[PDB]
């Protein structure tokens, strides 16, 4: 009753390597499960973090590398134009030569930075306009500053585009780091020096003199506003409930109620929206409905930036757009974020330029490299397969229905509906490999050259937003794929009620069809729950089997799933982690996905158990002394094995809505009375609470 | 009869993932051993080779960092220092602060660097000398140029330290890359932008005006001057025979016949070696002996040195100084050798800072690292199998002498004497773990700051070279070690005739107690009959048992020698290289360790069937189709599995004195009988010509 296959004998192995047996797994599952993998794995100085995920996605970078160095020969022009960008991103030598004179030439195009002109008004200041500056920056850059203009998906109407409103980003990684005390004082003392660092840097590269002070005023002047804008910003918990962020209302209702002064002048959103729309020959007419995500931050934006002046404006605007493009400059230009980037991801050096290039060219042509791996690493024979796994995991989810206990037949009904509506992606888009011409003319109008790599970056800004900007009057292009191929993620879409699964997450430890099943539920099944799941988490649930923002849930039951996923939010929120210093996760922000995590895990265990009563049981593993009860989530805690720098383990708890590996292990694991019943926990053990959270 | 332990089923695993089952093994072994470890162990960004051997020496540096990294309250003197020094190292932050302060604060010591001083002849012109220069650049900082002198032992009398006299190595690997052309083309063109960079990097902080024009002018020279001198060195393929090297005469001797003429005055041996010897209060009479190993080098620099000013050779001798430091400094001294790192190395960034911390540490105090890294890692159970191991290998390696046909009787006699008076060194000298008192009188001497890093490793430098010097007068005391016990290699002595197996090299694939016999004599086995056998190469067999350069070979025998290890030098040098662009390996400099190679399997193997013919066999291993005549061999190539990056490929091919793993693995195994015996090779497969090289 042992398994001899050379493969169960280095899968075997690897269960064995990563493991501690000498801990107790009713105390720490994770230490149990991963004890082994964290004392062999030390963090990359480039990485801000590193687990399974992490080297299976630069195992995939090295073969991006392989295919995108090759020499061209017998390629499509697609695949041609791919490897040219790769080119010219990887030669550094051509790059620093060039300084920062890329990046010097096309500021007059942004309105210029003040602080990096000797004479900013009268060279800009007559001409300028906060609409054109605003809408430049959008347009053509893709850069969203002081108001976020975007073209999406109507909510409510999945099949139609439609002009979205909301607070932008900030410089820093979230609102919370714009109080500079504690942890976040590293933070922003870093960040300020990182704007003095950029505006010298240009001003010596112009020939103009120094006035160091002077340039430090106007920086602190710059945080001093972008401290009030942050503040202004609404809180990402309060940010949770899709139907209450819809806000629809007319461009001439916008004009009316979130009115903005500027330079003494009333800020026009008819001219503003026009001049972003008409980039791509469409004219917005007063009566033009938009969706406004961020109402009360435009109201809390008028007292704000009617105190600065135009200079002040263009200050932060550029230098928000100056901070993104200082490193595709000279290694000098680089070396000014460094100090910023240490602050936030605790990385002592940016990622290898091949790295970055691959991953820039993957970004930005996701079809071409997506043919380009698939060809190199994937299998087709995976198709049916995690078809299979899916048409188990799917009935699971539905046949649960029937022992959730929060729910009234109504609504579970209607669950059931949006469960057998779900559609799926897997691997790859067939026509990247088998139609050539339309892959060619995907990227025709991109035209790129070696010597110029800024160049080349600067086209692609233009032609993504350009792309994008034109899909407000055409209806959605369903099918369309939501992400390449090359990549190590799977993913669900509300709006398209659809998951999707690329070709670089279908390998082990998640997936082979030439590893045991007990293997492939507890890694890619367990995946595949997840996404399913997250078509039913806090932010899923609102929408239905069409992808609109429509309740079908009953008060009753509404309130039920409120009430049984706040027992979620207060178990991962009151999680210390010790690479952030003790301090806690946030259990609302985080919510959907450890939703997610525990609906996903009891659906692929339960597939398991059919998948067992259908065909029997399997042979045990060689050298390790577990059942498959066992097996199952002992290979579920090593998907997730991982490990955190204290820089980006501050960062990702107020900006990742996922919890780290080690608590979505623990977490999921504690809710699970299998689990507990597979290694024997006793009751009350830190693996074994009496208080279980359940949910899917 | 198959093993099912969970030491078995990662040993199997091992194994099975290396090899490529799919290779025919009689027509390329490499590719059959190694081919699934190529796939699965691609070169790291950092690495410019990886293999076994160097995931190894990661395994063991991670070891070193947690042994490192944390201060206990009980560790003695010697283990404080170590961590300091550790510390000082890693903490990155303190060191980009300092920029190039240190090493512009030291310069004055080696006289300046013309080309990055304000006025080079007015500030060191006066004082300047080539005895001098070239001198504190030896007695201080270990950094040899134009003449390398060191103390050593007396080739001819082992119980001696004397003073050599030899042609230093280059600033490039190897006499070879100076011609510049083709593969060597990149080679010299970033070494030399390397120069102009680091001038400017150096002028920029000392506050002076950049001339790049005349900086290049400069710069040039220096590889002008350094062209003619790599061009003036003796071939390596020149300096095999120890008996031909070695050239004792007085220093007055050496005046007379090696006299040389710098800016216009006479080069003085008597002040020159004075200069360095009084550094440890050493005067050098007239009369005293010295070996000079280079005596047509010196010979050839005459007409070389005259043609320089003070300023070209100091720019020359401060560069080859400078040059190993740059990279000690901040990020901007560190990034100006990327170009030049890359074109040796075909690496894109430096390894990781902790790695070459530990790295580091490990090689400065070695007695102190070796130490922490037995204690923690260690076996201590193992020594006395080794010692076994080690005796049967011996004693078949006198047995065989019968089988050798091509020498005489008396030399065999010669032969098994000296392998009788071998003395073994096995995991770590006892002193290191028994004695704390010696330990810490060892670094009495050394004080490091926990913030610079830079002033810790000139105080090294300094201490090095003190300590070695000291020597000259004291006999060699042969109890004391010659490498560390946390590294992963072993070593032959010719002057102490002893073999030596540090704990790093103890472990899988080379031998553990929980891997198969097979495996162990396939692994280590091998390995202690390589450094048994180095005692009897063309370079061994020239010492006798107390490790003094005699000739114990009759003229018949030696004539022999030299007929059966010539076929050898054919067959390696006929292998191509296809990583190294087609570049052949060179079969003389390789000899001793392809000697080396093909003498310890044949012994390990020998040794082997003994051991199964005495005790029985083994159980088989799971999913792997082979008997353990076959796995002996199998581990002996996987022991060698690895790859190289094509410009380290062709670095390498011209400076390593042994072949690449590959041609190890090819080379010993075709021929040998009994490899083809095991895999049933066909006459005249690749893997079994019917031609065979036999020496030991
Ligand atoms: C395997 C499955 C659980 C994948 C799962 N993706 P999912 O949470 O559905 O999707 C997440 O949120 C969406 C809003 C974003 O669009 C996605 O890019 C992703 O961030 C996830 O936890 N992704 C995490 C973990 C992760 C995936 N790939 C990785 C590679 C390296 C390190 C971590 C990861 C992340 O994206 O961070
Ligand atoms: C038989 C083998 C187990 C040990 C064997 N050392 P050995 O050749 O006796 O000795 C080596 O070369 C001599 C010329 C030098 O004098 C020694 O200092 C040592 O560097 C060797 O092949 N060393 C190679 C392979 C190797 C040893 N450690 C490594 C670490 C990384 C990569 C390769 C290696 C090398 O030094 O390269
Ligand atoms: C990377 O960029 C460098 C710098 O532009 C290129 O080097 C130039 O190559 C052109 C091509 O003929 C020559 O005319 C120039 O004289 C070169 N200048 C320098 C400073 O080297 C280099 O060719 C690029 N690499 C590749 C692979 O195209
Ligand atoms: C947005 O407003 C600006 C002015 O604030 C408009 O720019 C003017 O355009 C007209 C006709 O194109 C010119 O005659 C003026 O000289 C321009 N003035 C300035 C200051 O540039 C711009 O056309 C408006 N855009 C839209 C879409 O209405
Ligand atoms: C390397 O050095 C040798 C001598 O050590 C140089 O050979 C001399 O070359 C000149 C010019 O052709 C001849 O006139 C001499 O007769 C040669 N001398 C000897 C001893 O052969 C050789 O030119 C040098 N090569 C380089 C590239 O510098
Ligand atoms: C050092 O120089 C001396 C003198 O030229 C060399 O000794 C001579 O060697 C030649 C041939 O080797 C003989 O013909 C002479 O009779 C020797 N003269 C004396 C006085 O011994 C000696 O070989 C040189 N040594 C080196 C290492 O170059
Ligand atoms: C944030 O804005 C509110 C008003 O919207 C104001 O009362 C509060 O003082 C502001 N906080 C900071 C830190 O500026
Ligand atoms: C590194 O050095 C800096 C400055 O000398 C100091 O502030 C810091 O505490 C040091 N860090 C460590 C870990 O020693
Ligand atoms: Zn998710
Ligand atoms: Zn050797």
Same mark, same amino acid.
């Given at each position: 009753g042992i398994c001899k296959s050379s493969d169960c004998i280095k899968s075997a192995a690897r269960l064995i390597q990563n493991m501690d047996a000498t801990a107790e797994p009713c105390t720490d599952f994770f230490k149990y499960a991963c004890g082994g993998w964290l004392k062999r794995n030390v963090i990359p100085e480039t990485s801000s973090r590193y687990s399974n995920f992490d080297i299976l996605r630069d195992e995939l970078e090295v073969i991006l590398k392989d295919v995108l160095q090759e020499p061209?020969?017998?390629?499509?022009? !697609?695949?041609?134009? !791919?490897?040219?960008?790769?080119?010219?991103?990887?030669?550094?030598?051509?790059?620093?030569?060039?300084?920062?004179?890329?990046?010097?030439?096309?500021?007059?195009?942004?309105?210029? %930075?003040?602080?990096?002109?000797?004479?900013?008004?009268?060279?800009?200041?007559?001409?300028?306009? !906060?609409?054109?500056?605003?809408?430049?920056?959008?347009?053509?850059?893709?850069?969203?500053?002081?108001?976020?203009?975007?073209?999406?998906?109507?909510?409510?109407?999945?099949?139609?585009?439609?002009?979205?409103?909301?607070?932008?980003?900030?410089?820093?990684?979230?609102?919370?780091?714009?109080?500079?005390?504690?942890?976040?004082?590293?933070?922003?003392?870093?960040?300020?020096?990182?704007?003095?660092?950029?505006?010298?840097?240009?001003?010596? &590269? &112009?020939?103009?003199?120094?006035?160091?002070?002077?340039?430090?005023?106007?920086?602190?002047?710059?945080?001093?506003?972008?401290?009030?804008?942050?503040?202004?910003?609404?809180?990402?918990?309060?940010?949770?409930?899709?139907?209450?962020?819809?806000?629809?209302?007319?461009?001439?209702?916008?004009?009316?109620?979130?009115?903005?002064?500027?330079?003494?002048?009333?800020?026009? %959103?008819?001219?503003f929206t026009n001049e972003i729309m008409s980039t791509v020959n469409i004219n917005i007419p007063n009566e033009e409905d938009v969706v406004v995500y961020a109402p009360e931050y435009l109201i809390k934006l008028k007292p704000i930036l009617t105190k600065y002046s135009p200079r002040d404006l263009q200050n932060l605007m550029s230098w928000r757009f100056i901070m993104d493009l200082v490193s595709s400059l000279s290694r000098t230009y680089k070396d000014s974020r460094n100090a910023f980037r240490k602050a936030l991801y605790g990385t002592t050096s940016e990622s290898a330029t091949w790295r970055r290039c691959a991953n820039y060219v993957n970004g930005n042509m996701e079809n071409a490299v997506g043919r380009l791996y698939v060809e190199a690493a994937f299998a087709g024979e995976s198709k049916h397969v995690v078809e299979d796994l899916i048409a188990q995991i799917r009935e699971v989810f539905i046949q649960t229905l029937d022992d959730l206990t929060w729910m009234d037949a109504e609504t579970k009904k209607k669950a059931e509906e949006k469960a057998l509506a779900i559609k799926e992606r897997i691997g790859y888009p067939d026509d990247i490999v088998s139609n050539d011409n339309?892959?060619?003319?995907?990227?025709? &109008?991109?035209?790129?050259? &070696?010597?110029?790599?800024?160049?080349?970056?600067?086209?692609?800004?233009?032609?993504?937003?350009?792309?994008?900007?034109?899909?407000?009057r055409e209806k959605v292009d369903k099918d369309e794929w939501i992400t390449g191929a090359a990549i190590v993620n799977a993913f669900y879409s509300s709006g398209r009620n659809q998951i999707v699964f690329p070709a670089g997450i279908l390998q082990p430890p998640f997936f082979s069809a030439q590893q045991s099943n007990s293997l492939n539920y507890g890694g890619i099944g367990m995946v595949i729950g997840h996404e399913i799941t997250h078509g039913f988490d806090d932010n899923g649930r609102n929408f239905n089997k069409d992808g609109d923002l429509v309740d079908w849930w009953t008060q009753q039951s509404a309130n039920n799933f409120k009430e049984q996923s706040q027992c979620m939010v207060y178990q991962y929120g009151n999680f210390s982690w010790d690479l952030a210093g003790g301090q806690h996760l946030n259990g609302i922000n985080t919510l959907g996905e450890n939703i997610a995590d525990n609906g996903?895990?009891?659906?692929?265990?339960?597939?398991?158990?059919?998948?067992?009563?259908?065909?029997?049981?399997?042979?045990?593993? @060689?050298?390790?002394?577990?059942?498959?009860?066992?097996?199952?989530?002992?290979?579920?805690?090593?998907? %997730?094995?991982?490990?955190?720098? @204290?820089?980006?383990?501050?960062?990702?708890?107020?900006?990742?809505?996922?919890?780290?590996?080690?608590?979505?292990?623990?977490?999921?694991?504690?809710?699970?009375?299998?689990?507990?019943? !597979?290694?024997?926990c006793p009751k009350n053990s830190y693996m074994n609470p009496e208080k279980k959270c359940r949910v899917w």
């Open positions: 061209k020969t017998e390629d499509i022009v !697609a695949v041609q134009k !791919a490897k040219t960008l790769y080119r010219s991103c990887v030669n550094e030598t051509a790059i620093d030569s060039r300084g920062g004179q890329p990046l010097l030439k096309l500021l007059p195009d942004v309105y210029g %930075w003040p602080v990096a002109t000797q004479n900013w008004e009268q060279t800009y200041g007559t001409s300028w306009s !906060a609409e054109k500056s605003i809408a430049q920056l959008n347009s053509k850059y893709g850069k969203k500053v002081l108001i976020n203009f975007f073209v999406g998906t109507d909510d409510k109407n999945s099949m139609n585009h439609i002009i979205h409103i909301d607070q932008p980003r900030l410089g820093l990684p979230s609102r919370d780091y714009y109080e500079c005390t504690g942890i976040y004082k590293e933070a922003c003392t870093a960040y300020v020096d990182f704007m003095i660092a950029v505006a010298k840097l240009i001003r010596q &590269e &112009e020939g103009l003199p120094i006035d160091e002070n002077q340039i430090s005023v106007e920086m602190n002047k710059v945080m001093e506003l972008e401290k009030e804008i942050a503040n202004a910003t609404t809180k990402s918990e309060d940010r949770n409930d899709p139907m209450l962020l819809y806000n629809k209302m007319t461009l001439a209702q916008i004009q009316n109620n979130f009115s903005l002064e500027i330079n003494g002048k009333p800020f026009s %959103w008819s001219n339309k892959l060619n003319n995907e990227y025709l &109008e991109l035209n790129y050259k &070696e010597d110029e790599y800024f160049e080349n970056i600067i086209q692609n800004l233009k032609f993504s937003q350009s792309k994008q900007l034109k899909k407000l996903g895990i009891g659906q692929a265990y339960r597939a398991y158990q059919n998948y067992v009563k259908k065909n029997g049981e399997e042979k045990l593993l @060689p050298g390790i002394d577990l059942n498959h009860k066992q097996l199952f989530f002992l290979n579920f805690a090593q998907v %997730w094995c991982g490990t955190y720098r @204290p820089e980006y383990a501050v960062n990702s708890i107020k900006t990742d809505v996922h919890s780290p590996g080690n608590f979505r292990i623990i977490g999921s694991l504690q809710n699970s009375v299998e689990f507990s019943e !597979a290694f024997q």
